Design a protein around this ligand. Structure first.
Ligand SMILES: [Zn+2]
Ligand SMILES: [Zn+2]
Length: 220
C-alpha cells in the first residue's frame, strides 16, 4: 500500500513500495524518481494506482517541479501497475514497443508513446539525461534497463537482482535461455554504473550483475 524514498544521489530518489504480492509476506518493488532541470521523471511505478499517486505526492511535497514522463521497465504488474495515475496526472508514459502488446494481453494498461530504436537485443535510445537500454529477452522479453549517465546509476530492474534472496525472483513470462546473456548487457552497456539500483531491496554493487548469470546457471 505504501511508499518509501531513499535519496541516493543529487537529482535522484529511489522508489520502494510494499505489497504482499510476490516475495512471500510484504514485498518490495523499485522505480526511480529522476529530475531533468525543472521537469521531473520516473522510471517505473509501484504495485498499484495509489502508490504512484503517493510517489507524485511526496514529490511536490519535497521535490516540487512537475512530472512530464514515466518509463516502464516492462509489461508486468509491478512495472505498469500504477499507470492510470500517470495518465490522470497528464504524464507521458513510455513503454518499450514490445510492452504495449503484452500489456492488454496479460491484464493491465499500455503506455502512451511506445519506445523503440530498442526493439531489436542489445540496443539503446537517448532521453534528456537518461539512457533507455534494451538487453534482449530476460525477466520478460520486454524488460528494460536505464542509467542516468553521470551518477554511475544503472537500473537493470527486475532483470538484475539482490544476492539477498537465494534464487531469482518471479520468472514467469520470460526466457532463461538468454537471461544470463542479458544480465551481462548492462555490465557493459553502462560499464561504469557502480550504483546498480534493482527493483527488490537496496542497491548492491556491480557484483549482482555477475552473480545473476552465475546464478541463473545454478538453476538451469
Ligand atoms: Zn517483473
Ligand atoms: Zn519483479
Amino acid at each position: 500500500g505504501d511508499l518509501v524514498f531513499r535519496q541516493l544521489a543529487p537529482n535522484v530518489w529511489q522508489h520502494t513500495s510494499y505489497l504482499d504480492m510476490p516475495g512471500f509476506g510484504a514485498v518490495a518493488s523499485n522505480g526511480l524518481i529522476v529530475r531533468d532541470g525543472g521537469r521531473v521523471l520516473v522510471v517505473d511505478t509501484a504495485w498499484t494506482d495509489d502508490q504512484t499517486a503517493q510517489i507524485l505526492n511526496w514529490i511536490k511535497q519535497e521535490i516540487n517541479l512537475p512530472v512530464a514522463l514515466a518509463v516502464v521497465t516492462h509489461a508486468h504488474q509491478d512495472k505498469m501497475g500504477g499507470m492510470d495515475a500517470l495518465h490522470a496526472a497528464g504524464i507521458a508514459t513510455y513503454a518499450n514497443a514490445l510492452s504495449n502488446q503484452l500489456a492488454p494481453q496479460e491484464g493491465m494498461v499500455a503506455a502512451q508513446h511506445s519506445l523503440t530504436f530498442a526493439a531489436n537485443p542489445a540496443t539503446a535510445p537517448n532521453f534528456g539525461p537518461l539512457k533507455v537500454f534494451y538487453p534482449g529477452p530476460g525477466h520478460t522479453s520486454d524488460n528494460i534497463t536505464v542509467g542516468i549517465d553521470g551518477t554511475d546509476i544503472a537500473f537493470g530492474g527486475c532483470l538484475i537482482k539482490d544476492s539477498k534472496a537465494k534464487s531469482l525472483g518471479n520468472l514467469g513470462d520470460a526466457d532463461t535461455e538468454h537471461y544470463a546473456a542479458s544480465a551481462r548487457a548492462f555490465g557493459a552497456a553502462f560499464p561504469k554504473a557502480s550504483m546498480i539500483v534493482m527493483s527488490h531491496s537496496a542497491p548492491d554493487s556491480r557484483a549482482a550483475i555477475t552473480h545473476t548469470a552465475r546464478m541463473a546457471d545454478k538453476l538451469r
